[PDB]
Design a protein around this ligand. Structure first.
Ligand SMILES: *[C@@H]1O[C@H](CO)[C@@H](O[C@@H]2O[C@H](CO)[C@@H](O[C@@H]3O[C@H](CO)[C@@H](O)[C@H](O[C@H]4O[C@H](CO)[C@@H](O)[C@H](O)[C@@H]4O)[C@@H]3O)[C@H](O)[C@H]2NC(C)=O)[C@H](O)[C@H]1NC(C)=O
Ligand SMILES: *[C@@H]1O[C@H](CO)[C@@H](O[C@@H]2O[C@H](CO)[C@@H](O)[C@H](O)[C@H]2NC(C)=O)[C@H](O)[C@H]1NC(C)=O
Ligand SMILES: *[C@@H]1O[C@H](CO)[C@@H](O)[C@H](O)[C@H]1NC(C)=O
Ligand SMILES: [Zn+2]
Ligand SMILES: [Zn+2]
Ligand SMILES: [Zn+2]
Length: 258
């Protein structure tokens, strides 16, 4: 996701932390954050080159098919196993288990990475085809503007919804997502939070590629103009994935710090 998606996910998550997790997050955040996790949920994107080793950790590349397997797909351009967003989530959640224990890692970074990557693993086109670079090479128009399909999913759909209903800001969208988490999707939310291991990234990635095939890629050809029909039909999936991301980020931090 772009800025708006990560902010939404982290705002939802921080309000769903239990007391012990809320305290740990406040302690691990720098003073400059003023206690707001969402103010740093794009930090990972800014260190893609400062920490070049981190760039493959934002996504998963799959073959041209609608399936994800950790062993097959979680690896970077040198084939190094684990170097994908799922592997990163396992890494940084494990690191955070070390908070306040008697026993090398910067746990502020671990928090910022897990927060961002929990978001990215929910963007459908972050678990999609290597052959089109997760939709980055699929050039279309979003209404009147040229854009690639990946960018439409990272940013354009959310921003257009913001402008359509929420006066070009994310607060109204956040409150509507929270409303639905409580009153429309309560049953689902309980399932989203369930994880028998730290975290369950492979579950999230498998959902993501299914969404990529069913919703993101579906019906789209190079050069198409995506407009109201695509926007209105895909918006609910975006809402679902943002809500899942926020719910799962909170549930994961609650497990880690409890
Ligand atoms: C789990 O989280 C940790 C902490 O963020 C993260 O560890 C980092 O791993 C990278 C490598 O993946 C380390 O970067 C290396 O640093 C060493 C020396 O400090 C350098 O020599 C390396 O440069 C060589 O290797 C590169 C290949 O990675 C080449 O491209 C390059 O040309 C050089 O030959 C490299 O920069 C980094 O230091 C650690 N940091 C810490 C604190 O351990 C780890 O990758 C995460 N794993 C996941 C998410 O799977
Ligand atoms: C733990 O990691 C964070 C993030 O990398 C470090 O905070 C950064 O520190 C650098 C250098 O002092 C500054 O330029 C940035 O302003 C800081 N970023 C943030 C988000 O706070 C922190 O210093 C690290 N702790 C260590 C290395 O002990
Ligand atoms: C909330 O759910 C209602 C009813 O299903 C739906 O009309 C609305 O679009 C949803 N809003 C969000 C932000 O998901
Ligand atoms: Zn993102
Ligand atoms: Zn992206
Ligand atoms: Zn990212």
């Amino acid at each position: 996701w772009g800025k708006e998606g990560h902010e939404i996910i982290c705002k939802i998550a921080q309000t769903r932390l239990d007391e012990t997790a809320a305290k740990a997050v406040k302690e691990l955040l720098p003073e400059s954050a003023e206690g707001d996790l969402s103010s740093l949920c794009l930090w990972a994107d800014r260190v893609k080159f400062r920490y070049h080793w981190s760039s493959p950790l934002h996504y998963i590349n799959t073959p041209d098919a609608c399936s994800y397997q950790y062993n097959r797909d979680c690896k970077d351009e040198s084939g190094e196993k684990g170097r994908c967003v799922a592997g990163a989530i396992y890494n940084y959640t494990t690191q955070l288990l070390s908070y306040k224990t008697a026993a090398q890692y910067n746990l502020t970074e671990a928090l910022l990475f897990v927060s961002h990557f929990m978001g990215d693993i929910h963007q459908p086109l972050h678990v999609s085809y290597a052959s089109d670079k997760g939709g980055n090479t699929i050039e279309v128009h979003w209404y009147t503007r040229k854009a690639n399909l990946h960018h439409i999913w990272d940013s354009n759909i959310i921003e257009t919804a913001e402008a359509d209903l929420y006066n070009s800001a994310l607060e109204g969208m956040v409150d509507a997502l929270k409303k639905n988490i409580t009153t429309e999707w309560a049953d689902q939310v309980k399932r989203w939070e369930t994880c028998t291991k730290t975290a369950c990234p492979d579950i999230y990635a498998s959902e993501g590629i299914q969404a990529a095939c069913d919703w993101a890629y579906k019906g789209v050809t190079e050069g198409d103009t995506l407009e109201d029909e695509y926007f209105y039909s895909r918006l609910p999936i975006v809402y679902q994935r943002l809500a899942q991301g926020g719910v799962r980020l909170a549930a994961t931090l609650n497990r880690i710090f409890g």
